Amino acid sequence: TTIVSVRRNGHVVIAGDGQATLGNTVMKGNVKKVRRLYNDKVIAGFAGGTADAFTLFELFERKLEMHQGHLVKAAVELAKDWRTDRMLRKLEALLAVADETASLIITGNGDVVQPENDLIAIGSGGPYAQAAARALLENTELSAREIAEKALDIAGDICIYTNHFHTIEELSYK
């Protein structure tokens, strides 16, 4: 899988492929790995269980309700329980989350990470996406969406665990 997030000119996105793999074969080819949260204000993508998601995202929404849209805080509060609550402790995943404010990664370890330029590239294809995104972002006037898209393709092209089905979720603000 490959989750790519990019932010340029009051535009932030999160794009992902749709391949789920079991051993050396493809189980499914159209997995939705990028959703939307907090009354379609907060976008997010992820790598993991379809339920872990539907549990980690629902909660995240509440943390946002308990911290007036302040992305970061809810995020900080999220990774908190996620590494503490006996039960929650078992869900494994990598949430990519971004709002007009900022974007970042949360990990079962409870970490909250803000990458160099709100550039996120998680998953087995993460680095190939990062490499292509970084390239584009530094040598062309392309858009945040055009980036993630193209970056994602490059990835699915290199990564044996990443395909070409996409699920993009933008966000305009300026």
Binding site: R62, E65, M66, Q68
Partner: protein, 408 residues
């Protein structure tokens, strides 16, 4: 409590009592003094005691009424005890401490009912939210825009608006409740449900004590009936006993109530007598001292009678009109009609036994016994009680004395 001047007190009292201006000023000075006290320093606050009054006058001329309105006017705990109620304790009978207890049990039945007023909106505001939450089960962790839970206030406001009379739709809510039920019930089951939370204990009951000690008003009726009379001796010590028994209460002491320790040092006492047989100076020394204020009330006159019929607020005549209205009937009293009602009342009181203004209630009531019954079958009519009507209904009765002792 009230900041009313004596003059303003008397005014306010003129709305219920006709004449008896002196007793009015006496009782008014007393109330104002309680205000005057709180405006003093430490020492002088202990020293200054109520100026207890001894009202002197014939039956039913406004003694108790004056003391009841005075009490009511200052939202003060009021109790009325008949003095002879203790003349039998030499054989057995209520102890005098009961006065302070009752003046407490009613000083409670007061703070309680008046805690239902203040809490009659709370259960129907920050508590009607009970049903509205089972009508539209609030979001999983409301967000937080302090207008977000005010947002529905479209889906929400529609449920509260339709809840202006429309119910009987069974649901359920929450020892909280949980139990399934209706709304002509879940809603009312909510009335008290959320009200017992606002009202606490050690303040409500603790306050009754505070009231009694500070604004209590004891009215000892027929204090003259416990004075010494030259007919015997054994019954006198019995009487003089009630006087000694009453002594601690007006001199300053502590009484025990199932609500706490009450101190009488500042209870105001209004004693009452006719003093036809005894005289105030027949009271024991210690009691005369504690009864500094003496005021007489005059007997009532026919004119006083006419005025009592119509002048006071919610006068018997006014009440009557109101009650007949309940039946959709319009009652009206002409001046001469009332002049005659009073006239009759005076006649019976003079020809038989004088019971003061009381007589007006029985006369007025007999006069109307017919309309009172037929009221429902007269709906939408204008009945006028004039001199003619009055005479046709009362003459025979008043004229016949033996009959007057029974029927009027």
């Amino acid at each position: 409590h009230s900041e009313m001047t004596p003059r303003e007190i008397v005014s306010e009292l003129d709305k219920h009592i006709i004449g008896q201006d002196n007793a009015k000023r006496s009782v008014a000075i007393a109330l104002r003094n309680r205000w005057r006290r709180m405006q003093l320093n430490e020492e002088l606050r202990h020293e200054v005691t109520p100026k207890n009054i001894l009202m002197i006058g014939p039956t039913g001329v406004g003694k108790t009424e004056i003391a009841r309105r005075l009490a009511k006017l200052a939202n003060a705990p009021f109790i009325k005890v008949e003095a002879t109620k203790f003349t039998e304790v030499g054989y057995v009978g209520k102890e005098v401490d009961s006065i302070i207890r009752d003046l407490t049990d009613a000083a409670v039945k007061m703070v309680r009912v008046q805690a239902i007023e203040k809490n009659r909106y709370r259960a129907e505001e920050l508590a009607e939210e009970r049903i509205l939450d089972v009508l539209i089960p609030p979001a999983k962790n409301n967000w937080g825009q302090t207008e977000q839970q005010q947002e529905p206030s479209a889906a929400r406001q529609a449920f509260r608006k339709k809840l202006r009379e429309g119910q009987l739709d069974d649901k359920e809510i929450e020892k909280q409740k949980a139990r399934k039920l209706k709304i002509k019930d879940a809603m009312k089951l909510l009335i008290e449900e959320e009200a017992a939370k606002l009202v606490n204990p050690e303040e409500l009951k603790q306050d009754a004590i505070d009231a009694v000690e500070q604004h209590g008003i004891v009215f000892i009726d027929e204090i003259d009936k416990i004075c010494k009379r030259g007919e015997s001796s054994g019954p006198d010590v019995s009487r003089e006993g009630v006087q000694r028994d009453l002594l601690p209460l007006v001199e300053g002491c502590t009484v025990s109530t199932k609500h706490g320790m009450v101190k009488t040092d500042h209870i105001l006492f209004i004693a009452s007598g006719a003093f036809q047989i005894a005289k105030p100076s027949d009271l024991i020394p210690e009691l005369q001292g504690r009864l500094p204020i003496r005021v007489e009330l005059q007997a009532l006159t026919t004119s006083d009678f006419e005025r009592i019929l119509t002048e006071p607020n919610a006068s018997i005549t006014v009440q009557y009109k109101a009650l007949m209205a309940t039946e959709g009937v319009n009652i009206e009293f002409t001046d001469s009609g009332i002049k005659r009602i009073a006239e009759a009342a005076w006649q019976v009181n003079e020809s038989t036994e004088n019971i003061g203004a009381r007589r007006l209630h029985t006369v007025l009531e007999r006069l109307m016994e017919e309309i009172s019954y037929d009221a429902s079958d007269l709906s939408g009519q204008n009945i006028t009680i004039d001199a003619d009507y009055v005479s046709k209904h009362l003459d025979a009765l008043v004229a016949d004395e033996d009959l007057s002792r029974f029927i009027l």
